Design a protein around this ligand. Structure first.
Ligand code: T07
Ligand code: NI
Ligand code: NI
Length: 284
């Protein structure tokens, strides 16, 4: 038997960031300046994104190494926040549209955007940690779902197959390919097991802004005409559900949960289309 449905807990005090670490423009504003930026990056921006992506991948790995029964999601946040700040990176989530922490921690039926708090992880949970770094004027964005103790087969297989669907999608990226191949491959793979791929949340172009207006669907929609070109930077980040797609948002305005409380898993990397293929920027 696995735990029952989650409820929100209490947040820790806001974690400070030294002032010499530049803030993204949206910190202190109610919305963000994003969605109309070019999709192909310059070489200088790409080089900076490799830095941001490695630092994000570091923070995710350190926080993920900490996932175990008994640890709170706030403890994961303090680990991610300190790794980012000690690397001179601003945690991009902190202050985005008022988001109060430095990463998102999404257990079990939480599709995305969970807020680190007093929630205690327990045996059988699956814990998504999403870490984003802003450094060098650019963002890196990455996430993974980590098992806590012995996870029930249904849930273990959801996590492993979601990781596999993400890697199969990443491996289709190449110049000249329709962007829509990504959601074709993910949805085809998920459909093997009767999983449902989330539609209303998507991958995104990312560069000097976090959601730059490029949208990467994770479901099949071949009418999209966008082609992958060298220098494009964007994420692949499917959320795959055991249950139905219907969801609710908690009163905090962030936490998105499945309406039927069946569990859901996600993995995410920031990618660069190269002249021949793809480079994952959010690798160690
Ligand atoms: N689409 C998406 N990728 N990773 C997330 S975690 C939330 C988040 C992280 C950073 C920033 Cl600047 C904005 C947001 Cl919404 N969401
Ligand atoms: Ni993310
Ligand atoms: Ni993302």
């Amino acid at each position: 038997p696995s735990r029952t449905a989650l409820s929100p807990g209490v947040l820790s005090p806001t974690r400070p960031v030294p002032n010499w670490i530049a803030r993204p423009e949206y910190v202190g504003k109610p919305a963000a300046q994003e969605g109309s930026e070019p999709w192909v990056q310059t070489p200088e921006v790409i080089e900076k994104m490799r830095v941001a992506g490695r630092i994000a991948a570091g923070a995710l790995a350190e926080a993920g190494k900490a996932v175990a029964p008994g640890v709170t999601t706030d403890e994961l946040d303090r680990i991610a926040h300190e790794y980012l700040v000690d690397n001179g990176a601003y945690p991009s989530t902190l202050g985005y549209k008022g988001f109060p922490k430095s990463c998102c921690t999404s257990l079990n039926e939480v599709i995305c955007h969970g807020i680190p708090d007093s929630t205690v992880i327990t045996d059988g949970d699956i814990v998504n940690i999403d870490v984003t770094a802003y450094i060098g004027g650019v963002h890196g964005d990455t996430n993974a779902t980590f098992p806590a103790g012995d996870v029930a087969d249904e849930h273990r297989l959801l996590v492993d197959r979601t990781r596999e669907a993400t890697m199969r999608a990443i491996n289709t990226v190449k110049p000249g390919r329709a962007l829509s191949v990504i959601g074709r491959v993910i949805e085809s793979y998920a459909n093997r097991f009767g999983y449902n791929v989330v539609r209303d949340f998507t991958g995104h172009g990312i560069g000097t802004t976090f959601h730059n207006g490029l949208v990467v669907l994770h479901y099949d929609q071949p009418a999209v005409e966008t082609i992958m070109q060298p220098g494009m930077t964007f994420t692949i980040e499917p959320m795959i559900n055991l249950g139905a797609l219907d969801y609710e948002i908690w009163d905090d305005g962030w936490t998105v949960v499945t309406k039927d409380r069946k569990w859901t898993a996600q993995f995410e990397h920031t990618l660069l289309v190269t002249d021949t293929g793809v480079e994952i920027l959010t690798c160690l």
